[PDB]
Design a protein around this ligand. Structure first.
Ligand SMILES: [K+]
Ligand SMILES: [Mg+2]
Length: 101
RNA sequence: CCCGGCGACGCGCACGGGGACCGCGGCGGGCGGCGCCCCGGCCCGCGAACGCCCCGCAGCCCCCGGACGCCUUGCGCGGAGA
C-alpha cells in the first residue's frame, strides 16, 4: 500500500528523466501494433470503447497493460504535466526498474 | 418493414460581411441666371429572374506529426492531439 505507491511514484519519475515514453492515445496505438511498448498505463476514467480497444491490441502483442489508480488529471500530475493524460506508454525504462507496476 | 432527416422555430448589448440607399471627385450631354464673381448652381448618365465557370471570412471535418503556444472588441481552444 503506502510502501507500494511510493515505488510506483518513484518509477514513474525515473522514466521521464532517463528513458523514452509518449503521452496520449494515438501515440499509444501506433507503438503497440509495432511492438515497441514495454508497458502501457491507463487512467481510471479512460473512455470505455477506447479502453476495450487498447486491451485487445495489447493481448495480441503481449504488451502488459495496467491501470493507474486515479483520474486522468492525476496521471498528468504524476508524470509532471498541466494537462490530462489518458494513456501513458513506456518505450524504454532507462533507470526505472518497472517491477513496481 | 424498421431507424432517422428536412419541414421546424425565444430574447439581448455588441462585433463582422453583403445588398439597397446616400454623399464627394472626375469625365460626357443638356439647362439657368448673370450689377460684380463664377472650370463654385441645377437635371440626366440605366442592367432583372434564370444557366454555366470561378472566388468565398467564420464554422465543422481529413492526412502527416507530437507540443511552454494559437487567438478575440469580448472570449475561447489544445495529449479525448495544439
Ligand atoms: K414551423
Ligand atoms: Mg412557427
Amino acid at each position: 500500500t503506502k510502501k507500494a505507491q511510493d515505488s510506483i511514484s518513484l518509477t514513474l519519475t525515473l522514466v521521464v528523466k532517463s528513458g523514452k515514453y509518449t503521452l496520449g492515445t494515438d501515440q499509444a496505438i501506433r507503438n503497440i501494433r509495432d511492438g515497441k511498448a514495454q508497458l502501457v498505463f491507463m487512467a481510471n476514467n479512460c473512455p470505455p470503447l477506447v479502453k476495450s480497444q487498447v486491451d485487445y491490441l495489447c493481448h495480441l502483442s503481449k504488451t502488459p497493460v495496467r491501470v493507474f489508480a486515479g483520474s486522468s488529471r492525476e496521471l498528468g500530475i504524476a508524470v509532471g504535466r498541466q494537462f490530462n493524460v489518458s494513456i501513458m506508454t513506456i518505450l524504454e525504462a532507462g533507470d526505472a526498474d518497472l517491477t513496481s507496476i
